[PDB]
């Protein structure tokens, strides 16, 4: 599914991301925009053989199982395919684990390079929430 901006903001809020670990809703919307262009079915293969999955491009080296990332972990206890669903539950619940690790949203390189420090509230401007 390719979400609209406000559509995703509303879904993320329903799924409990607004102010999760202190990160306002616009941070999560910005991160999704630059990670996946709001497409739940996004995938990208990394040079190390791991793959990033879903609207927040969650990586198989640590967070999910895909059966083809040798030596990796599955800390969200899910198949990586669950991160591609129209239903954002698995992506949200896993992102909550990830952001609760020590580096916060810096885990998402696109957040650090494109969202951090910017007017992230603009991503939710105008949306019914
Ligand atoms: Na894995």
Swiss-Prot record:
**Membrane-crossing residue ranges in chain numbering:** none
The protein's GO terms of the molecular function aspect are:
beta-N-acetylglucosaminidase activity; identical protein binding; lysozyme activity
Record's keyword annotation contains NAD:
no
- The set of disulfide-linked cysteines is 6-127, 30-115, 64-80, 76-94
Q: In which tissues is it expressed?
A: In the egg white and polymorphonuclear leukocytes.
- Where in the cell? Secreted
> What is the first-listed, main subcellular location in coarse terms?
secreted
Recite the UniProt keywords alphabetically: Allergen, Antimicrobial, Bacteriolytic enzyme, Disulfide bond, Glycosidase, Hydrolase, Secreted, Signal
Q: Where does substrate bind?
A: 101
Record: active site: 35, 52
Q: Which GO terms describe its cellular component?
A: cytoplasm; endoplasmic reticulum; extracellular space
Alphabetical list of CDD domains matching this protein: LYZ_C
Gene Ontology annotations of biological process type: cell wall macromolecule catabolic process; defense response to bacterium; defense response to Gram-negative bacterium; defense response to Gram-positive bacterium; killing of cells of another organism
- EC class of this enzyme? hydrolase
According to UniProt, the reaction catalysed is:
Hydrolysis of (1->4)-beta-linkages between N-acetylmuramic acid and N-acetyl-D-glucosamine residues in a peptidoglycan and between N-acetyl-D-glucosamine residues in chitodextrins
Annotated C-type lysozyme domain ranges read: 1-129
Q: What is its EC number?
A: 3.2.1.17
Name the protein family.
Belongs to the glycosyl hydrolase 22 family.
Q: What does this protein do?
A: Lysozymes have primarily a bacteriolytic function; those in tissues and body fluids are associated with the monocyte-macrophage system and enhance the activity of immunoagents. Has bacteriolytic activity against M.luteus.
Subunit and interaction comment: Monomer.
Q: What is this protein called?
A: Lysozyme C
> What gene codes for this chain?
LYZ
């Amino acid at each position: 599914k390719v979400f609209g901006r406000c559509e995703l903001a509303a879904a993320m809020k329903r799924h409990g991301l607004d102010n999760y670990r202190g990160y306002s809703l616009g941070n999560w919307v910005c991160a999704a925009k630059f990670e996946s262009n709001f497409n739940t079915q996004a995938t990208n293969r990394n040079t190390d053989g791991s793959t990033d999955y879903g609207i927040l491009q969650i990586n198989s080296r640590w967070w999910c199982n895909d059966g083809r990332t040798p030596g990796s972990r599955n800390l969200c206890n899910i198949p990586c395919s669950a991160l591609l669903s129209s239903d954002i539950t698995a992506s949200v619940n896993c992102a909550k684990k990830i952001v609760s690790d020590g580096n916060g949203m810096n885990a998402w390189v696109a957040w650090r390079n494109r969202c951090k420090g910017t007017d992230v509230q603009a991503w939710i401007r105008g949306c019914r929430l």
